[PDB]
Amino acid sequence: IDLGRVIGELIDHRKLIISITSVFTLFAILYALLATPIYETDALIQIEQSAPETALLQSRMILGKTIDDLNLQIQIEQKYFPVIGRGLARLMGEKPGNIDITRLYLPDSDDISNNTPSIILTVKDKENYSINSDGIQLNGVVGTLLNEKGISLLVNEIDAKPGDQFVITQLPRLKAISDLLKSFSVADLGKDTGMLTLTLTGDNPKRISHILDSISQNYLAQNIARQAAQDAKSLEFLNQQLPGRAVYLQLLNRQQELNIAKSSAIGNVRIIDNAVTDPNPVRPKKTIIIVIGVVLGLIVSVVLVLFQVFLRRGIESPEQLEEIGINVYASIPISEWDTLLAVGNPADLAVEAIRGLRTSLHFAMMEAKNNVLMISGASPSAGMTFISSNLAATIAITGKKVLFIDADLRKGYAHKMFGHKNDKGLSEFLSGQAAAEMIIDKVEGGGFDYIGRGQIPPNPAELLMHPRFEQLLNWASQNYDLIIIDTPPILAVTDAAIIGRYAGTCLLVARFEKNTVKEIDVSMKRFEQSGVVVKGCILNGVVKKASSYYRYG
Amino acid sequence: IDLGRVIGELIDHRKLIISITSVFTLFAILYALLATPIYETDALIQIEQSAPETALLQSRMILGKTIDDLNLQIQIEQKYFPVIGRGLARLMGEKPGNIDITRLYLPDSDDISNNTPSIILTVKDKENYSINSDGIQLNGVVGTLLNEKGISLLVNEIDAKPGDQFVITQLPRLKAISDLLKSFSVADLGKDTGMLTLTLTGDNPKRISHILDSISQNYLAQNIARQAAQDAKSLEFLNQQLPKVRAELDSAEDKLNAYRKLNMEAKSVLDQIVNVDNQLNELTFREAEVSQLYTKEHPTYKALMEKRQTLQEEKSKLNKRVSSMPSTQQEVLRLSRDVESGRAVYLQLLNRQQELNIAKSSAIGNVRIIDNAVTDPNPVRPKKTIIIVIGVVLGLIVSVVLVLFQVFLRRGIESPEQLEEIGINVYASIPISEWDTLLAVGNPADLAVEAIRGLRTSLHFAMMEAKNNVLMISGASPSAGMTFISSNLAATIAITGKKVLFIDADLRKGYAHKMFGHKNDKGLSEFLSGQAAAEMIIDKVEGGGFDYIGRGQIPPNPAELLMHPRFEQLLNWASQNYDLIIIDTPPILAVTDAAIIGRYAGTCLLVARFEKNTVKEIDVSMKRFEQSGVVVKGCILNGVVKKASSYYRYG
């Protein structure tokens, strides 16, 4: 988990980490290139406070007058069936479609849920067009207003590209307020200065400048209207109260004072400069999400790789087994590769390591009480028969006579791999229905005598206790230089602990990443309980990255 | 990781550190000497608050007036094909080129992406010149304006150096405002005082001082428009003029609707005439103010009449072009001219009424300018000695982060103490020799040979009372130098006067016979196979003076051969007919041959390259030797660099 280990596993998993980081950056870049650009326009309003004005601008009288001025409750979008059709259309350089509807009146379904009757325009040419509400397509021409089925459309200046689809939505006036008010924004930047910087953000650049100018003009007009409206209510009741006659003349003097004031009462709000749209979109923020894509890919990659590190629990190196006090006799690397590897590809790495095992056993197998070696995998799929068979081959070619007993009576398949006469296997001998001679075979490849399990017997462990088995071993250890026995795991059945009574040397075979140290520890302790002293293990299937062996020649 | 050998390996990698820090400092030197200098000018403006003015000056109203005043939307640069041509041209002392365009009208491509049409001026002489837009080069002279292909250009007082290239960009008004505003800056420095320090930063010194003066004088003229506007008739003139102009606007759009209910040159000339008319209006109403604010002999007023005589020439040429094309186009062109000219005048008048009202509600009195803007001769950017020191520390920090990274990169052995911590008797540290014959007989006094003699003495002490006189030397890896050490050691022991036999039991890829001169037939493998006799395989290295046994042909079963008892017989015979027997074996990390021969060797040694083989390889090799019943006596470090070896010449 150290920095060195970190970089090691990173370069080892460089494919995964770069793949995930690159794919998230691909999502980021496609999103940055497909998200519609959003321009921002600004204006400067000057007054002589400004705290009421930042709230009166965003009031519904102001926005509500712009909406009715520009008909912004008539919403128009070019149709693109995919969620990214519009973005790719912009990327291709296609000029976006746009039309002007000066007067819209839907059939006004205006239901509780679907209060936005949605219609689609099919552009037929630059002059005529067709409108489908729910299938009923009404063909129409710009100029002439379409008044059918309670549906009133006055659409003019339709765009060029025909065949397009334009979704029209007569969303409610309150909605046409709320969206704008969401986009609209005000500030002061002087905390007392009359300057207000209105900002409106939107997609259609030319539209937002007009909308902001409309807001500014409405604000100008309404402030002119208010100061005058004070005097206007005064004037209204003066007009209502005119009938004493000298007082009538005094009221006429006040009337003439008030009347002109209304026309002349223009002030207190100022458009220092009308709205213009900044050509550079402010959103989507390029180079701010792509770096977020990079960092998101990096963080998720590390949080996944660390999770996988804390996932696996199998053996990782012989040092783990030697920590418990287990003499790992070999580390057989996994070979890329029906005949024996030790005779098919005699110079493979996995066979060089088995020769390295042969020498170490040859040293460790003298002083053993007899020349019978028992090899029991830690579990199925630990390769016990692979290692035992190749070891038998590599010891046969040396020149010693080897007998390879496959005492895995439960699911042993060595006879399925050496070529066999399935009759008269091992089990058929223990049952007493076969003699010691008709069971041995000759693997022509390895050159070592082979004894197969034969038929699966109903009672394996009961058979192995029969005293004929020790007779077999006593005879063979006199007629052979080495005897290798295959036995089932000790975590599953007790066959291994029965055969181990007669074996001089016993070894476990542990698959590299499959079997855990717990399985080896429990297996060795369970062998000891049964009076069988496990000599050591033979780590197997170690990946070539962690295997010390390499080609030499 | 400690100061002592921190300074140590920094003295070691001094070449690297000064190399890269110097590279970065040269990068900084060239950046500082090539970055275009930026000058800033400050002007001081006096009023009697000023918080509104800090944002009113930076409004598009005031800046937008200066842009239209100095034609700042016409951008010009000397063209340099490299990114650093301008800087190097300055470094040579070449006076930068500059020209003057009082009137530019590009073909107005103004696309969505390339909204800035670009042309290049090719300077022919001090008088004439040629301009290429996209290949069509139009030859023109100062004075007369070029009005061709919808392109109107009036350039005058062009620089001297001919053959140069001037890129011209008619960037839009908003861009020409935004860049200026980015460069422009205001402050107060009193937090209440009437002192407004204006600052403008730019490259061309004279250009910036003039721009700041124009800004200041526009603001002054606006606040004088205060004092003059209230009684001015212009207010009522605008009040009455707007309705009639909007009336003809309405009439013109009605005429468009009536005639509506695309020849390229038609739009080109239409846009050109409209631009000309807008400029003619704005210049008339501009003359309206320069006439009483300034005098006729004042050069600014002369500039107004000159640029309009230019504009009237341009309109005359445009009308000449209009007359020539078909009436089907002339009708539409006149109808569109009336219309968008009406909107242009209408927008102007709206503006006109607007800032005329700005005179009214401004409560400021006198807006005296204290001192006109002057540019600081010293450029403020690029900052000298503030990127250079950053270049220094950047090189230094990248040096430390790279050198420490390389420190934590290598994993090999670094000193015999690393092995002796594990418990390995390092018998020698053979230094690397600079140098086909044996080094022990080619250059007998080389340091590596003296260290090999030292190994000879240490062995001769340690090799006695071993069970026999056979020595097995096993490399920790291929390319650990096993055969170098073994061969030279055999030579150094043979010259002493002992009979030495050198068996190359590296049956897999042994090549000693390729180096001693050989009869390749009947090597070692041909003996284990039983097809050769014991005496027929032995040789004589004439140089070293020791008997040599080569591997012979590579057999298909090495480890199976080495187990044959003939190997036992050979060693038993030789150890009786020789004083010392050296055996070369393949690594034990790769094959099992070494653990087969170590069955019979009195002494076994590992050879480890200095920085290649790790401590783990030696540890694993010794433990795997022990598993096989072979006790490795010790190690022999090899190829140690002369910086770390204690050996030196003597004599």
Side-chain angles (χ1 to χ4, degrees):
Chain A
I1 204 60
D2 173 64
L3 166 63
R5 182 71 182 90
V6 165
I7 182 57
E9 62 191 343
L10 285 185
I11 301 297
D12 293 331
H13 294 89
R14 73 169 185 255
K15 294 304 179 181
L16 175 67
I17 185 166
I18 73 174
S19 63
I20 190 167
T21 297
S22 58
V23 69
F24 291 169
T25 59
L26 294 174
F27 291 166
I29 191 166
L30 62 83
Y31 174 78
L33 270 294
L34 285 175
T36 55
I38 301 299
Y39 307 100
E40 171 275 359
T41 175
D42 62 358
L44 201 58
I45 290 298
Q46 188 269 330
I47 63 171
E48 193 277 330
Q49 299 179 330
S50 76
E53 309 320 293
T54 176
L56 182 43
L57 274 162
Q58 314 185 29
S59 83
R60 287 188 302 274
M61 72 184 77
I62 286 284
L63 310 184
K65 191 185 300 188
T66 53
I67 299 303
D68 302 9
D69 290 332
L70 292 174
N71 290 318
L72 299 191
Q73 81 282 25
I74 305 169
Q75 188 171 33
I76 303 299
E77 292 83 3
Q78 184 74 280
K79 177 58 185 179
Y80 308 84
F81 63 98
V83 70
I84 62 178
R86 179 182 180 189
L88 61 83
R90 174 186 68 259
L91 294 174
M92 171 155 208
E94 313 180 356
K95 181 264 292 179
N98 75 95
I99 303 174
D100 291 331
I101 295 182
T102 59
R103 186 267 182 276
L104 157 69
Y105 181 88
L106 285 179
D108 298 359
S109 58
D110 291 345
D111 293 331
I112 297 89
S113 304
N114 46 305
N115 56 3
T116 70
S118 306
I119 314 297
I120 297 90
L121 182 62
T122 55
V123 184
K124 301 191 306 188
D125 70 349
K126 56 179 301 313
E127 185 63 26
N128 51 53
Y129 44 82
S130 184
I131 297 89
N132 52 1
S133 63
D134 286 343
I136 312 100
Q137 301 190 3
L138 267 49
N139 309 343
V141 191
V142 292
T144 59
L145 199 158
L146 277 296
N147 284 312
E148 306 80 8
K149 311 175 304 172
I151 309 171
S152 170
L153 276 296
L154 176 50
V155 64
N156 314 268
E157 305 87 30
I158 57 174
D159 206 10
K161 186 55 199 61
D164 303 359
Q165 307 174 356
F166 280 114
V167 179
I168 304 168
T169 301
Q170 195 177 28
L171 73 165
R173 191 172 184 274
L174 169 59
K175 197 57 172 55
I177 296 302
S178 176
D179 49 355
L180 177 50
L181 171 56
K182 180 67 174 66
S183 44
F184 184 71
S185 299
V186 176
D188 194 1
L189 59 78
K191 181 69 176 177
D192 194 72
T193 71
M195 295 296 172
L196 294 156
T197 57
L198 321 180
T199 65
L200 185 58
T201 69
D203 45 357
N204 192 343
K206 315 307 304 312
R207 187 69 143 186
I208 72 175
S209 65
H210 273 217
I211 297 178
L212 192 49
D213 291 331
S214 177
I215 289 185
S216 296
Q217 305 293 341
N218 284 8
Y219 176 77
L220 195 76
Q222 70 84 30
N223 189 359
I224 297 184
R226 183 131 161 90
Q227 185 174 356
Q230 183 66 41
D231 303 359
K233 206 173 188 184
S234 302
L235 184 155
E236 172 60 30
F237 182 71
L238 286 179
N239 296 15
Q240 296 165 350
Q241 196 60 12
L242 287 185
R245 199 50 55 181
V247 183
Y248 186 85
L249 298 184
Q250 180 66 33
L251 288 189
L252 287 183
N253 291 332
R254 190 63 175 185
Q255 174 80 7
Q256 264 53 70
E257 294 179 10
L258 302 179
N259 299 355
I260 181 60
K262 181 178 181 179
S263 60
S264 59
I266 296 178
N268 210 7
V269 302
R270 266 191 162 190
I271 316 174
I272 300 298
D273 50 352
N274 63 6
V276 296
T277 68
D278 186 12
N280 304 137
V282 302
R283 272 185 281 98
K285 302 180 186 175
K286 296 174 183 177
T287 317
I288 301 299
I289 54 175
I290 297 169
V291 304
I292 288 300
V294 166
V295 75
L296 192 60
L298 175 67
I299 301 299
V300 74
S301 66
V302 305
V303 74
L304 182 135
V305 168
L306 277 296
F307 182 76
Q308 276 209 357
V309 160
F310 270 21
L311 188 153
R312 74 201 201 310
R313 314 251 201 181
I315 312 186
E316 302 173 351
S317 56
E319 283 86 309
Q320 295 190 13
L321 295 195
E322 311 206 30
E323 271 185 350
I324 312 301
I326 316 165
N327 302 322
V328 164
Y329 274 96
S331 308
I332 314 302
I334 187 65
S335 178
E336 150 67 16
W337 291 32
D338 73 323
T339 183
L340 292 184
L341 179 50
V343 297
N345 186 7
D348 194 1
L349 288 187
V351 174
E352 291 294 346
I354 291 168
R355 297 191 181 89
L357 170 62
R358 149 164 55 83
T359 61
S360 78
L361 283 192
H362 168 88
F363 176 80
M365 261 196 78
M366 63 208 85
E367 293 84 4
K369 55 178 186 175
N370 63 349
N371 64 341
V372 167
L373 164 60
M374 180 187 86
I375 294 180
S376 65
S379 67
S381 70
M384 71 155 298
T385 182
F386 167 63
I387 290 188
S388 44
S389 61
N390 294 277
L391 178 45
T394 59
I395 296 193
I397 62 186
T398 286
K400 300 177 172 183
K401 298 173 59 187
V402 182
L403 174 62
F404 178 83
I405 302 182
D406 188 18
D408 185 327
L409 288 180
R410 284 154 199 280
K411 58 157 55 178
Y413 54 78
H415 72 307
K416 308 185 205 165
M417 182 179 72
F418 300 158
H420 65 279
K421 67 181 178 67
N422 44 23
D423 51 350
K424 320 302 174 181
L426 181 51
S427 54
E428 289 77 341
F429 165 76
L430 293 182
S431 300
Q433 65 183 357
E437 281 59 25
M438 283 73 74
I439 56 187
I440 72 174
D441 202 359
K442 299 288 180 181
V443 189
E444 70 278 17
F448 59 87
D449 301 353
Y450 163 68
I451 303 181
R453 63 170 175 75
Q455 279 298 338
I456 299 179
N459 50 350
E462 289 57 36
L463 270 188
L464 292 169
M465 311 205 58
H466 192 283
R468 285 197 207 93
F469 193 64
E470 186 173 3
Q471 305 167 19
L472 172 58
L473 301 190
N474 281 16
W475 165 81
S477 68
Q478 300 176 342
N479 285 341
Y480 285 80
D481 306 300
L482 187 84
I483 309 174
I484 296 182
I485 306 183
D486 286 359
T487 68
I490 188 52
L491 293 186
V493 306
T494 187
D495 291 331
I498 299 183
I499 299 138
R501 298 300 294 160
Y502 319 110
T505 300
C506 312
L507 310 168
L508 285 182
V509 178
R511 176 76 65 173
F512 179 47
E513 290 315 339
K514 289 197 171 188
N515 304 133
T516 184
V517 193
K518 199 56 187 174
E519 296 187 13
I520 310 297
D521 199 6
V522 177
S523 312
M524 293 177 70
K525 286 176 182 173
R526 192 170 312 191
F527 269 112
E528 196 186 64
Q529 276 191 327
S530 175
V532 172
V533 172
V534 159
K535 196 72 178 186
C537 300
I538 302 180
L539 189 62
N540 184 359
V542 62
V543 297
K544 285 186 178 176
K545 175 282 291 183
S547 76
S548 45
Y549 295 86
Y550 45 83
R551 190 178 154 268
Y552 181 81
Chain B
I1 179 59
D2 202 337
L3 167 65
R5 293 182 183 174
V6 168
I7 200 59
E9 293 177 350
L10 276 296
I11 295 304
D12 184 1
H13 305 288
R14 72 165 187 259
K15 291 311 176 182
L16 196 64
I17 174 171
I18 294 169
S19 72
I20 52 160
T21 67
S22 295
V23 169
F24 273 14
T25 59
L26 276 296
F27 271 120
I29 303 301
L30 61 86
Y31 176 83
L33 274 297
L34 274 295
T36 58
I38 302 299
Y39 309 120
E40 63 185 342
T41 181
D42 62 278
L44 182 67
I45 293 299
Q46 185 194 338
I47 50 181
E48 195 278 331
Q49 294 179 334
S50 72
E53 316 320 299
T54 59
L56 179 53
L57 291 159
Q58 315 192 34
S59 79
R60 294 193 294 275
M61 181 165 38
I62 306 311
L63 306 196
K65 198 176 306 176
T66 292
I67 309 302
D68 294 330
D69 184 1
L70 294 175
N71 312 273
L72 297 181
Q73 81 282 36
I74 297 89
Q75 191 167 213
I76 294 169
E77 311 131 14
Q78 185 64 60
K79 179 53 186 176
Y80 309 88
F81 61 100
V83 69
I84 62 170
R86 182 182 181 183
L88 60 86
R90 174 183 73 261
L91 298 164
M92 179 56 201
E94 309 181 0
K95 181 266 290 181
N98 71 91
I99 61 173
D100 190 17
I101 297 86
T102 53
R103 172 65 177 107
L104 159 70
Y105 180 85
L106 290 175
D108 286 16
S109 59
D110 293 331
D111 294 331
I112 296 93
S113 304
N114 45 305
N115 56 5
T116 70
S118 300
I119 59 172
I120 295 91
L121 168 60
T122 56
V123 178
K124 303 191 303 185
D125 70 352
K126 286 79 181 175
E127 309 299 272
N128 52 53
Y129 44 81
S130 184
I131 312 96
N132 51 3
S133 63
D134 55 356
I136 308 103
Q137 302 189 2
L138 267 51
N139 300 329
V141 193
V142 292
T144 182
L145 61 83
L146 293 83
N147 184 271
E148 307 81 5
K149 311 176 308 175
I151 305 168
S152 178
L153 165 65
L154 176 57
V155 62
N156 315 270
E157 308 89 27
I158 294 169
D159 204 20
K161 183 56 201 65
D164 304 359
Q165 303 177 1
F166 281 106
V167 59
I168 293 168
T169 302
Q170 190 182 34
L171 73 165
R173 196 170 187 271
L174 181 62
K175 196 54 171 55
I177 291 176
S178 180
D179 46 5
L180 178 48
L181 188 153
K182 182 177 57 54
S183 47
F184 183 69
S185 300
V186 190
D188 189 270
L189 61 83
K191 283 80 60 185
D192 194 70
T193 67
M195 293 312 95
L196 287 155
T197 189
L198 318 184
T199 48
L200 183 55
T201 81
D203 47 356
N204 192 340
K206 297 182 179 179
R207 197 64 177 173
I208 76 171
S209 41
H210 280 40
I211 296 173
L212 192 46
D213 283 351
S214 182
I215 287 184
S216 81
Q217 286 180 352
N218 280 358
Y219 185 69
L220 184 103
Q222 177 203 47
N223 279 14
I224 299 307
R226 181 177 181 170
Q227 303 177 5
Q230 293 290 353
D231 46 4
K233 297 292 185 183
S234 174
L235 164 74
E236 188 62 37
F237 159 70
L238 286 185
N239 294 142
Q240 63 84 30
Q241 185 69 9
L242 190 64
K244 59 178 71 43
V245 181
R246 181 177 65 83
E248 293 177 350
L249 186 153
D250 301 352
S251 307
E253 41 176 330
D254 302 357
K255 284 182 286 187
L256 282 184
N257 311 325
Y259 284 86
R260 293 165 179 172
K261 306 304 175 182
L262 276 182
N263 187 284
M264 294 300 293
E265 186 193 355
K267 278 74 69 177
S268 301
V269 304
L270 171 63
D271 291 331
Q272 197 155 17
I273 305 164
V274 170
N275 187 333
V276 174
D277 301 357
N278 309 339
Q279 295 214 73
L280 299 174
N281 302 321
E282 297 180 14
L283 210 49
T284 303
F285 303 68
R286 297 294 181 192
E287 291 186 3
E289 306 191 6
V290 181
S291 56
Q292 73 303 359
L293 289 181
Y294 303 96
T295 65
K296 182 176 183 177
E297 76 280 355
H298 182 74
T300 301
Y301 185 76
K302 298 174 173 174
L304 305 183
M305 183 66 75
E306 293 179 354
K307 183 178 179 180
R308 295 176 64 186
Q309 63 84 30
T310 296
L311 294 172
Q312 292 156 340
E313 292 180 355
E314 184 178 347
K315 172 200 294 299
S316 180
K317 291 189 174 182
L318 287 165
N319 299 330
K320 294 182 235 237
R321 299 173 62 181
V322 169
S323 301
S324 56
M325 294 300 293
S327 60
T328 61
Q329 314 304 126
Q330 300 173 346
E331 183 178 1
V332 188
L333 285 191
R334 300 187 299 266
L335 275 66
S336 309
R337 269 201 51 181
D338 301 358
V339 168
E340 293 177 350
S341 302
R343 293 182 183 174
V345 173
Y346 188 43
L347 290 181
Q348 297 172 358
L349 298 180
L350 295 174
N351 302 324
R352 296 207 227 237
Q353 160 183 92
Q354 175 78 347
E355 63 185 342
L356 212 47
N357 295 131
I358 294 169
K360 306 180 176 183
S361 75
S362 66
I364 283 184
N366 50 352
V367 65
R368 182 189 199 188
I369 294 169
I370 296 188
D371 49 359
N372 58 6
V374 292
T375 81
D376 185 10
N378 293 340
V380 299
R381 280 175 291 100
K383 305 179 182 178
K384 299 182 173 185
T385 72
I386 307 300
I387 48 184
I388 301 299
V389 299
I390 297 299
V392 170
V393 175
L394 188 73
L396 186 151
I397 301 299
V398 69
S399 180
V400 298
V401 71
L402 188 149
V403 165
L404 277 296
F405 182 76
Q406 279 205 351
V407 164
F408 270 18
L409 171 78
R410 64 190 182 188
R411 293 182 183 174
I413 304 177
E414 307 196 311
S415 54
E417 183 178 2
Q418 293 191 11
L419 301 187
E420 287 181 354
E421 273 166 296
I422 304 304
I424 313 170
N425 297 323
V426 168
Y427 276 90
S429 308
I430 317 299
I432 186 167
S433 178
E434 150 70 4
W435 291 33
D436 75 325
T437 183
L438 286 183
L439 177 55
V441 300
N443 179 14
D446 193 5
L447 295 182
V449 189
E450 297 297 344
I452 283 174
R453 296 192 177 92
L455 171 66
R456 152 162 60 88
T457 68
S458 79
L459 274 195
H460 168 82
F461 175 77
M463 181 150 303
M464 63 184 55
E465 293 177 350
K467 56 179 182 179
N468 66 340
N469 60 327
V470 175
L471 166 61
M472 188 202 90
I473 294 170
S474 175
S477 176
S479 83
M482 176 178 73
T483 187
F484 171 65
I485 290 181
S486 288
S487 66
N488 306 292
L489 169 57
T492 56
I493 301 188
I495 61 173
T496 287
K498 300 187 173 189
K499 305 176 62 199
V500 176
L501 177 64
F502 182 89
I503 307 179
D504 186 17
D506 186 336
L507 294 183
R508 281 146 205 273
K509 55 152 61 173
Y511 64 92
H513 61 78
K514 307 178 208 161
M515 292 177 72
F516 298 167
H518 64 265
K519 63 91 176 179
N520 45 24
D521 51 355
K522 320 299 178 179
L524 179 60
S525 61
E526 288 71 353
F527 164 74
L528 294 177
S529 299
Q531 65 183 177
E535 291 68 25
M536 187 66 204
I537 57 184
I538 297 169
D539 210 357
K540 293 179 179 179
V541 187
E542 68 275 16
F546 56 81
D547 289 345
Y548 167 75
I549 296 189
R551 59 168 182 73
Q553 281 296 344
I554 305 182
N557 52 4
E560 280 61 35
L561 266 184
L562 293 169
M563 293 181 79
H564 200 279
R566 293 196 196 96
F567 199 49
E568 187 127 351
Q569 305 168 23
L570 173 63
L571 299 194
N572 286 21
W573 169 83
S575 65
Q576 296 169 345
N577 288 343
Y578 295 94
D579 302 295
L580 180 85
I581 309 172
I582 305 180
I583 300 185
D584 280 2
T585 67
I588 192 63
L589 292 197
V591 310
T592 185
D593 293 346
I596 298 176
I597 304 139
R599 280 315 320 156
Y600 310 128
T603 316
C604 307
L605 303 167
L606 281 185
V607 178
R609 180 73 71 176
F610 181 47
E611 293 177 350
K612 291 177 70 68
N613 301 142
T614 82
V615 188
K616 183 178 179 180
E617 304 184 33
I618 321 294
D619 205 12
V620 173
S621 304
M622 293 177 70
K623 294 189 277 195
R624 188 173 315 192
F625 265 112
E626 291 188 356
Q627 285 194 118
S628 300
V630 178
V631 174
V632 171
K633 193 75 178 177
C635 182
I636 297 183
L637 200 65
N638 180 10
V640 57
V641 302
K642 291 188 180 123
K643 172 196 59 182
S645 74
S646 46
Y647 281 85
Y648 48 83
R649 280 278 308 296
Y650 186 84

